[PDB]
Amino acid sequence: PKFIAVKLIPKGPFRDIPRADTLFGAIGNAISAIHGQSAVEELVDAFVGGARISSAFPYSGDTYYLPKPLSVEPALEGDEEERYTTAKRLRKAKYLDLKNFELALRLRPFTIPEEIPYARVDVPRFWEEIRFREKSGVYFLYSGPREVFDGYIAPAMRFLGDLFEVEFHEMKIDAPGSEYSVTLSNALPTKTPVLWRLLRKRMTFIAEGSIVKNDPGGMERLELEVYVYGLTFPLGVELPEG
């Protein structure tokens, strides 16, 4: 499917490579500052209506990175000493470039990014930041109606820019049709999922890369009114039998 990618060109270092709950938070608060609570309510409606955003991922030059689907972890066996070393380094990798992501979805053989375009510098005093590489940045994907993108997501992102600037282009991901899909966002599942990593925030989130079977995720409102985004950004994924 084709999606709007929103590139974040950073002016200076980052402290969060933000995931989708926080991106929605930021955009929700930004929408209220620009248009008032009614619009936030219109945004939540678009999102419950079908619109989705991913978590943010690194990019470098014209290379887009995506999260390794956990579907391949149980399938790596599909030399004796060559298999042992590689299996572990591939189990460790958190990202894949778009080309090898597409492969990993169809369970075909694929490779790992050699160098990844960011480094967590943790200077002592102690707290840390993310150093981006040259022409390197973070992006996230929007799927949904354009009028919602232009009407809410675009303006919000401009406002949040003023630590970065923003640009966005069409982006295509080829993905196998299947009963099973990866999440490109962190989600609050509705049903118990197939493969996952838990994320703790307090709230329990399925991680990016987890696999679900027809699970849209959900939103939650709370009183501290503020919405927390836990919707799933599904791409189809081929699973091994097991």
Partner: protein, 709 residues
Amino acid sequence: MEIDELTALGGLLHDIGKPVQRAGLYSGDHSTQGARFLRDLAENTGRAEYELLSLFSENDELMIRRIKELSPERFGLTMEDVLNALWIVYEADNLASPQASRPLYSVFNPGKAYPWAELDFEKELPVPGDVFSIRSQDYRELVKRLWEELSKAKLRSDRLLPVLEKYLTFVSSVTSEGNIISLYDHMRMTSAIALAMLRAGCTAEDGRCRKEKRFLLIEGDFSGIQDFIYRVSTLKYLRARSAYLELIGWDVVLEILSRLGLTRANVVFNAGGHFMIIAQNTPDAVKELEEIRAKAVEWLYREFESDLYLAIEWEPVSGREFGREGNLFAEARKRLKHKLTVRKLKRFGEIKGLFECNRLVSLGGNLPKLLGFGRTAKNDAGVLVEGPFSGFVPYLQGGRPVGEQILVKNTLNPGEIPESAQFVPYFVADYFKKDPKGGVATFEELSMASTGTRRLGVMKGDVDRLGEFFSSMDSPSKLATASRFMDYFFKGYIGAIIEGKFGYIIGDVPSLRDWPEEPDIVVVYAGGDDFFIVGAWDQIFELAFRVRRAFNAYTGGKLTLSVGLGYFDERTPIYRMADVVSERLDTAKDEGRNRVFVVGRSRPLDGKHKLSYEWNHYEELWRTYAPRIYAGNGRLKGKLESKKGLLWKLLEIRELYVRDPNDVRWAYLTLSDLFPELVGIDTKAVERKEPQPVYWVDGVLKIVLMAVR
């Protein structure tokens, strides 16, 4: 006695005829000769049960008569049941499956072999060397010591195993060339398998049990171990968090054994938070496993949120699979490893609602004078900590043991504990530099004791390519030796290595100061092939080479370690240190293995320059340069007093190599007789596509300057 305890002890003593034949005591074959030894032992001290266990060494004509003559009523055992026990134990022997003098050959290097000695963590390090015959005398001494211990033993698998472990650990269970299985391991694994068939209920078979999936391999593995131990708000505490994990795993393993009825012989291995158990495949058992797995996850999930998880799985297996046809056993494990990986990608999927400190401080504080812990009910006076299924009551020197089971530390001798208390030994690497107060030393104190700079030393270490090693094991008894020997290196001998033992074996290693009597070192965790140790940086730097060398010897030079070293400001938080040495460790494992991350460094990113050093590289480098510039005990050589900058100049010159390796200025740049190795341009290295000598030197210089400052 009952049928279960008999069938346990039966498989356990089946092949006890071996050590008596080899001593030359009775003149039969080992089958004949083992019967007579127990029977003679039954007559001594009048415990007739041994004569009931003497039948395991031996058309069912005489056999039925000879059992009949012993009264089954006296032990309340059915005559038909006794025959079932004999045939069951007969089979167990085959599934876990000549000169008298041959020794046991090392599972790490089948070419070298073990000198007869008994298991003792104080006396000496087991080192496989040259093949010597073991005299008939030494087996005689063995068999007497053995006989005396069996006399006073209480006849419960938990009281038998420890005397068999002491004496029979270093005897070849079969006296053939390249035989690698410890007798003790074969015996427990025969007791293990035989009890599984009995709990299985198979009977009157002579492959229903053998070619039928009547067994259960159960692998239990914790995930989140280091997230649970480190990543805290103090070493005293950090030692209790590691101590607390060991009890939690025991609390589960024992409950599994308790509820399936099994004995500790069914525990193949239990280290590094990884356990395996052979069991029965009855629908009652899978139910009890399923009931237990959920309760442990619920309590573990409630106690530490998502921090620590217990993945448990089990594969139905048969007797075929316990051995090689055309390696099945490995294949039966591989399919279970898969179930186990998949389960780690479903953390806490046994909680449907998932999608809707002071005690440890006292425990760390009272950590020094305790002999063990009692596994009682949760609501019980004196319980200091609690695991999923049970409370744990610290058992002190003067005090009384409390509990159905008692867990005692670093000893195979029960000592004065009750007759009805199940004895469970556990070993742990618990060295610690004692402070002036009887308490363990602090990061601050440890960092003060260093030579030169006042840094805390940290090392994390791992054995390379262990999975491939443990997969190559053909049989249960082989896997049992492999794991027990491996675990005992870290849990048994790292303390020794720290105290300064095994000098002649270890040799000259890199070092900054004369090795102390009370070294400023504290083990955090060490066992099942991984370890985390802290102390005065220079003592930690040296202990890395001491441990790699001992380990090289302990194996046949056939297994290697990877280590990452860190030298931190004493104020640096614990979790950060873990993160950096972790990063440094799996950098060394990533640049090849068998290499050590000595100290952080600056290098060219031309993919031709490794941060790590192969051990023998760094060792040779230290042997070369350090004696020319360093005098020892935090003192530079006298010639270089008022020439200390010369060393700093070399570090700056290396930088110009780091700027660009290709620029030849560091040639331009170069008493001149000191460091001749760095002046020339290396030609073979250019051809080999390798770094210039200059690149490597900083690993020595930065360590010396650190000690000299």
